[PDB]
Paper text:
Transcription of the ribosomal RNA (rRNA) precursor by RNA polymerase (Pol) I is a prerequisite for the biosynthesis of ribosomes in all known eukaryotes. Here, we use single particle cryo-EM to solve the structure of Pol I from Schizosaccharomyces pombe (Sp) in a monomeric (apo) and an actively elongating form at high resolution, showing that Pol I cleft contraction upon transcription activation is common to both organisms. The architecture of Sc and Sp Pol I is similar, despite poor overall sequence identity. Nevertheless, we conclude that the principles underlying Pol I regulation ‘activation by contraction’ and ‘hibernation by dimerization’ are conserved among organisms.
To determine the structure of a monomer, we stabilized Pol I by crosslinking with BS3, followed by quenching and size exclusion chromatography. Comparative structural modeling reveals that, similar to Sc Pol I reconstructions, the cleft is extended in monomers and contracted in ECs. Consequently, the ‘bridge’ helix of subunit A190 is mostly disordered in monomers (poor density despite higher overall resolution) and forms a well-structured helix in ECs. We do, however, observe a density that we attribute to the ‘expander’ (‘DNA-mimicking’) element in Pol I monomers. This density is located between the ‘protrusion’ domain of subunit A135 and the ‘clamp core’ region in subunit A190 on the upstream region of the active center cleft and appears to prevent unspecific DNA binding. Due to flexible connections to the ‘jaw’ domain of subunit A190, we refrained from modeling the exact residues of the section in the Sp monomer. Location of presumed expander density in the cleft is comparable to that observed in Sc Pol I dimers, while the element is flexible in Sc Pol I monomers. In contrast to Sc, density for the expander element was observed in Sp Pol I monomers, hinting at an additional possibility to prevent unspecific DNA-binding to Pol I monomers.
Numbering used by the authors:
A (entry chain D): 12 to 34, 44 to 59
B (entry chain G): 3 to 156, 167 to 172
C (entry chain A): 1642 to 1681
D (entry chain B): 1029 to 1046, 1054 to 1120, 1128 to 1174
E (entry chain F): 61 to 142
F (entry chain A): 1 to 142, 172 to 195, 203 to 258, 321 to 347, 354 to 411, 421 to 451, 461 to 724
G (entry chain A): 1063 to 1158, 1162 to 1207
Write the structure that this text describes.
């Protein structure tokens, strides 16, 4: 039970790291949010 | 806004007995269930996690059961739409009862006509009775402009 | 009731000491095989 | 001769209805140094329950299961009343809304202790058992 | 609280008459719930006597925490006990 | 109990304390105002003592509050209001004594403030475990000067705690004695030391009525009524004297009286349908009775507010007040008001903490007459195949005992060594009695396979894939099942024998050796025979408390097991030196003695 | 606890010095010397024991200075007194002089066996002993 501070770029780089670490529906929606947030 | 967040949380994971050789497998086994699922402590949907390390305290065995327990530090990526500020989404359904959007392609937005002011009028096409364009008081069509921006209540609001 | 009202007025806290108090709350005793905790 | 594998339970304390093991059997078992056998024969096999407890306010009765949160969807995520004042909020059976009272966890305590909590609160004196 | 260091441990090196029973019990439960057996079986079926075969050779996990009356505790590997 | 249940809580402490007026309001869900219980439709009255939001009644009535049937709803309390508040029946004695020591004109205790400050310093210094330091405060010998003395004592205590910082029985053994001395002291003074006046005394009753005459004339130079005035008087005393009452118990408002008492759900308040007569219970009877008195007070106070008119009005008001007080008193304490009350269902010596908590009736425990058998073993106990079929214990199914369990379910719950029934990984129980052997075989083949129709069927907490399918199997020739005999005086009287399952007889068999231990005579006294379900319990019964390890009584070293009459006379006759055997008798008698195959290892 | 060694269960044969010394070949294998002598201390408490047997004071009982669970010399005083009075008084089993000893026995070998016996037969810590006394007073009363 802890919380800390964070910026958006850390969140995006960590979204990248989580796309990388554990490898159907979940990562599909994650690619969806990745394509929506960027661009 | 910057509605995406990542928070390093600490949880109390129950390592099943079948995986007492390596804990990592039994940790992943129930971490990969929480993904895309509402983790209510942080009040959001978990999207990402990495750096799977356990505070080494020789995970404790429940006093009558074979599955162990341990505190594990993992970093979640909950999306928090807690009425922070303006957001934006693509419309899929439109009706003179509410407007339907998808933000990030995932999360639903049902903006009723209550939070919409009267000044925008809906035209009912001859091909589909329900589906049609919700024209604004200016006269602009929103179907080509899929991107609709608003502010949130908790649900959206188009009234200023 | 006597010991009860006495413990209620003062509001006294046990950790959980004796096997009888450990039994009323449903946990294992602190004696015997319940003395230690066994870890992985 | 009477062999009891399983059968009826009690109205109040959820005990086997009226074989006797205790108050001298307990002497024998905690004499042998058999904590787990005592906790088995007395707590496990007689009356076992998983009751929710409010972790913050530390009590066991002022908890309530949440009602009409959404469609079938997810689990009814229990909350607390005595610790209370869209996702977090919830209603009551009569329709009263509440908020707060999130720290609720599972504990295992014999049904007779729940009955004792009942007959004790009817006297207004209540124990606030903590949980870690 | 304190976790007493490995250099100085004041508790008895003997597997007390109780730690043996509970170690065997919890190991039997673990093996009954489809855990890895660390020693070759010869055809024994009971999910407990397998734990006896494990303990006879000292090939068992599950270090024990001995809680001294201060509140401190020692961490003894079941290989480490006598 | 299940082994898959993951409970992660660890109950670390309980703490008692009074529940104030605001909390019984917050925790409650409904109010009970209607003295009527059931209507013509026979369904529970809304807001009534049997409200569906109070507790779900039977006949498939889902709780209004939680929207879940009687199987899953833990009951929800209620409250009933009364603006009377009457004083608590338990602290009534302690409340009355603290009132006796009150100074109404002084608004403090009758004691000298320096003595009360002394006891406050004592109870401060006993807090952190300082005994001789608690007693050293008094080695000082001397209002303003009394104020200086109080400052000396307080600074002594402050410096002492400062030196100490940088519960046990002795601490509690001293606290209780010091508080007993305090309460002997405060009840002694009749004149104020701060006010110097004589506060008006109060005289009590056993029927819960209190008051006394006004001041005397010489002291002026210097009966029963409403409880509200004494309530506010005690509240004033408590708010004006803060620190001492804080250490002694900051708040003490609603300890001694009750303003809105709670009702337990229907789950704890049933109506035993004994044949035809239907009495709800004494508990709901008494609650209904206090409810009637409450609504009567409401109507009467309405009548009084809207109005010797004051004489009769106040008379009837105080009479209804005293009925309400006497009624609450009759509820919580049955030793008053000439109907079992709560204190009398606890303290009954037939009730809780001796017949429901320490010694509970138990599942999986047979009971039968014993009879002797010399053929089995010193460990083993013979059980007929009837106890073989009627006592079962759960067992997860693994790769190498799968054959045993498949064969057990094949044999079925009517044929030893058959199994009882299956428990799924999610937690349901698939019985095996009504099934036919075709269905039982079809089910037993698909007994070791992942059947949960998802990775995590109910919700996103995924240990439901790791659990095994638990077959309840019958006892068999190695299961360790406790024996006992009431009265069980000393620990060798409750032992754990291996079961050996004999055919034919309907009387369990045990060997003679244990006859000396259980203090039994095989003449008609019978023995409880338990079965430790979980595997931890049977492991500890097999290694710690098994019979062959009970060879020495605890009182003295002298052993208690060992052979008896016939064996020992034949011993004197066999070891005697005028005996001789040919080869045949030697071999035969030896093999009768050994009997390896039934035991093994050789 | 009550001058530790144990409640009667594991303390019966300490007074039977003739029996332990009689065979002595099975008791060393019952105590498993090669596994016990490894991790427990042997020289310290045994050395200090003799100094504690010096009649003058200022040397406490070995049990108080050194715990008896791990220091394999520390044993109650009367036990030392009795084992030594037996070893000196009636050693008809114990051979001696000392040269003829080194075939199968040694006075020191037997005293080491007895020290190991006391050590291995301590009270099993964690025992609930209150109910042991309670029942040992309830039983013989009835
Ligand atoms: Zn509450
Ligand atoms: Zn309910
Ligand atoms: Zn005064």
């Amino acid at each position: 039970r802890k919380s800390e501070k964070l910026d958006k770029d850390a969140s995006s780089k960590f979204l990248n790291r989580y796309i990388q670490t554990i490898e159907e529906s979940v990562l599909s929606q994650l690619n969806r949010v990745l394509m929506y947030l960027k661009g | 806004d910057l509605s995406l967040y990542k928070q390093t949380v600490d949880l109390y994971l129950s390592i099943a007995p079948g995986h007492s050789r390596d804990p990592l497998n039994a940790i992943q086994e129930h971490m990969d269930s929480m993904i895309l699922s509402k983790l209510p402590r942080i009040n959001g949907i978990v999207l990402a996690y990495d750096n799977i390390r356990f505070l080494e305290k020789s995970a404790k065995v429940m006093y009558d059961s074979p599955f162990s327990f341990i505190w594990v530090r993992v970093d979640v990526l909950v999306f928090s739409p807690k009425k922070g500020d303006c957001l934006e989404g693509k419309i899929n359904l439109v009706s003179p009862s509410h407007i339907g959007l998808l933000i990030l392609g995932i999360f639903n937005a049902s903006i009723p006509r209550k939070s919409i002011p009267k000044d925008w009028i809906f035209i009912e096409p001859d091909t589909t009775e329900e589906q049609g364009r919700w024209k604004t008081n200016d006269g602009n069509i929103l179907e080509p402009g899929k991107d609709l921006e608003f502010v949130v209540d908790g649900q959206g609001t188009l009234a200023n | 009731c006597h010991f009860l009202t006495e413990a209620a007025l003062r509001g006294d806290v046990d950790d959980l000491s004796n096997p009888s108090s450990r039994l009323v709350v449903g946990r294992v005793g602190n004696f015997g095989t319940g003395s230690f905790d066994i870890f992985t | 001769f009477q062999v009891r594998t399983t059968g009826p339970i009690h109205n109040l304390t959820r005990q086997p209805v009226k074989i006797r093991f205790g108050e001298m059997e307990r002497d024998a078992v905690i004499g042998h140094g058999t904590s787990f056998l005592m906790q088995d024969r007395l707590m496990n096999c007689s009356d076992y329950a998983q009751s929710w407890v409010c972790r913050d306010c530390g009590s066991i009765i002022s908890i309530m299961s949440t009602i009409s949160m959404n469609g079938v969807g997810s689990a009814s995520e229990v909350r607390c009343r005595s610790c209370a004042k869209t996702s977090d909020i919830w209603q009551d059976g009569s329709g009263k809304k509440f908020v707060g009272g999130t720290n609720t966890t599972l504990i295992a305590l014999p049904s007779v202790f729940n009955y004792l909590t009942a007959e004790l609160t009817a006297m207004n004196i209540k124990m606030m058992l903590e949980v870690k | 609280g304190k976790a007493v260091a490995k250099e100085d441990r004041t508790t008895t090196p003997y597997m007390t008459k109780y730690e043996r029973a509970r170690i065997l019990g919890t190991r039997a439960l673990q093996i009954s719930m489809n855990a890895p057996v660390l020693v070759d079986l010869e055809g024994e079926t009971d999910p407990l006597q397998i734990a006896m075969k494990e303990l006879a050779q000292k090939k068992i996990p599950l270090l024990v925490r001995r809680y001294l009356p201060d509140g401190s505790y020692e961490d003894w590997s079941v290989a480490e006990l006598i | 109990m299940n082994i898959a249940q993951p409970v992660s809580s660890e109950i670390k402490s309980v703490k008692f304390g009074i529940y104030d007026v605001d909390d019984v309001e917050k925790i409650s869900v409904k109010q009970i105002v209607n003295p009527v219980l059931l209507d013509n439709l026979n369904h529970p009255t809304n807001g009534g003592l049997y409200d569906l939001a109070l507790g779900p009644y039977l006949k498939n009535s889902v709780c209004a509050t939680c929207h879940l049937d009687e199987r899953y709803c833990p009951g929800h309390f209620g409250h009933i209001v009364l603006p009377i508040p009457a004083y608590h029946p338990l602290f009534f004695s302690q409340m009355y004594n603290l009132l006796r020591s009150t100074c109404l004109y002084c608004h403090h205790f009758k004691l000298s403030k320096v003595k009360v400050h002394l006891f406050f310093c004592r109870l401060k210094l006993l807090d952190y475990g300082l005994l001789n330091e608690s007693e050293m405060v008094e080695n000082v010998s001397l209002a303003k000067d009394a104020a200086t003395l109080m400052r000396i004592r307080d600074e002594f205590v402050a410096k002492s705690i400062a030196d100490s910082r940088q519960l046990t029985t002795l601490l509690l053994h001293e606290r209780k004695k010091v508080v007993r001395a305090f309460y002997h002291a405060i009840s002694s003074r009749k004149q104020c030391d701060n006010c110097q006046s004589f506060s008006p005394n109060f005289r009590k009753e056993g029927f819960a009525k209190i008051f006394e005459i006004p001041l005397s004339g010489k002291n002026l130079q210097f009966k029963y009524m409403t409880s509200t005035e004494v309530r506010n008087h005690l509240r004033r005393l408590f708010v004006k004297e803060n620190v001492v009452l804080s250490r002694l118990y900051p708040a003490s408002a609603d300890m001694f009286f009750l303003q809105n008492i709670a009702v337990p759900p229907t789950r704890f308040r049933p109506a035993s349908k004994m044949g035809d007569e239907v009495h709800e219970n004494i508990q709901n009877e008494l609650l209904t009775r206090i409810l009637q008195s409450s609504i009567q007070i409401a109507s009467l106070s309405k009548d009084s507010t809207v109005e010797e008119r004051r004489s009769r009005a106040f008379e009837l008001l105080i009479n209804a007040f005293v009925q309400l007080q006497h009624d609450v008193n009759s509820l919580i304490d049955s030793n008053r008001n000439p109907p079992p009350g709560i204190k009398q269902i606890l303290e009954k010596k037939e009730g809780l903490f001796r017949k429901h908590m320490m010694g509970k009736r138990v599942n999986y425990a047979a009971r039968s007459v014993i009879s002797p058998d010399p053929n089995i073993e010193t460990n083993e106990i013979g059980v007929p195949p009837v106890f073989a079929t009627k006592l079962t214990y759960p067992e997860p199914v693994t790769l190498y005992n799968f054959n045993e369990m498949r064969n057990a379910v094949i044999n079925g719950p009517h044929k030893w060594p058959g199994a009882s029934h299956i428990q799924n990984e999610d937690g349901t129980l698939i019985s095996l009695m009504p099934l036919t052997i075709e269905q039982r075989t079809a089910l037993a083949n698909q007994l070791l396979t992942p059947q949960s129709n998802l990775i995590s069927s109910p919700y996103s907490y995924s240990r439901l894939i790791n659990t095994n399918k638990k077959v309840y199997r019958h006892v068999r020739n190695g299961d360790m099942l406790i024996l006992n005999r009431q009265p069980t005086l000393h620990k060798p009287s409750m032992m754990a024998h291996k079961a050996r399952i004999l055919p034919g007889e309907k009387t369990i068999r045990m060997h003679y050796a244990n006859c000396n231990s259980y203090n039994a005579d095989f003449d008609g006294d019978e023995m409880n025979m338990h079965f430790p379900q979980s595997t931890n319990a049977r492991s500890e019964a097999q290694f710690i408390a098994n019979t062959d390890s009970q060879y020495l009584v605890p009182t003295s070293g002298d052993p208690l097991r060992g052979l008896i009459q016939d064996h020992v006379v034949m011993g004197v006759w066999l070891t005697c030196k005028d005996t001789f055997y040919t080869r045949d008798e030697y071999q035969q008698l030896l093999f009768q003695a050994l009997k390896p195959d039934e035991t093994g290892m050789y | 606890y009550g001058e530790d060694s144990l409640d009667v269960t594991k303390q019966k044969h300490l007074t039977q010095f003739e029996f332990s010394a009689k065979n002595y070949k099975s008791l060393i294998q019952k105590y498993k010397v090669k596994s016990v002598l490894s991790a427990v201390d042997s020289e310290t408490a045994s050395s200090y024991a003799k100094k504690a047997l010096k009649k003058p004071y200022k040397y406490d009982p070995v049990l108080d200075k050194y715990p008896p669970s791990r220091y394999l010399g520390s044993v109650s005083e009367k036990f030392q007194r009795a084992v030594d009075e037996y070893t000196q008084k009636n050693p008809d089993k114990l051979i001696a002089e000392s040269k003829l000893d080194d075939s199968l026995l040694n006075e020191s070998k037997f005293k080491a066996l007895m020290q190991l016996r006391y050590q291995q037969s301590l009270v099993d810590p964690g025992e609930s002993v209150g109910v042991l006394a309670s029942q040992s007073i309830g039983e013989p009363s009835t």
